[PDB]
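INFO batch 0412 | record 1 of 1 | parsing
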Amino acid sequence: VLGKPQTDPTLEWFLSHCHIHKYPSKSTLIHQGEKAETLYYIVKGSVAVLIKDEEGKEMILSYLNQGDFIGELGLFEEGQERSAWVRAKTACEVAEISYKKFRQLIQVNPDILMRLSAQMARRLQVLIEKVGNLAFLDVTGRIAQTLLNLAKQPDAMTHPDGMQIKITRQEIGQIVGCSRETVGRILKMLEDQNLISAHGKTIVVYGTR
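INFO prediction complete | emitting tokens
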């Protein structure tokens, strides 16, 4: 009752240690930090990492796709996230595994951490990914970085005009410091062929800006 794909000897050897869970579009995989001691790995599909303050501001930290680990932040913090919700953007297959199980793998075979750490080591530095560019400025500054991140991720297919994303003032704003209210205001400019062809649900970005 099994049979999954693979690419590397360590990616498959470890994949058998976790429980690959299939999550459809808009299917939250993590809730703040319900785990607080479990590592995740998007075996397929794509998801989004949301964050909330002590008031519940809610903000899309960044986007993740197949081959991306989640909750690993706790492996060097405390639990697993406890402040990084995970909302799947499309039919994905993220696997989960208790630290007590993962920590054993990284120690049994020095490679699982080299591939996982490499993701986080560039996840907050990737720049323009909405993770290491949010420090710049919210509305009138972040709204742009977002549209760019999607164009950098495999989620946004390469169109003959730009990219094929499944977001807009509705989701975009969430990634920024405001909502579609103030965010959409700036989108009205680009959407009008002044920076980016944002047709709403589908944002056509000319290869990241």
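INFO post-check: The two ends are 46 Å apart (CA to CA).
INFO record closed
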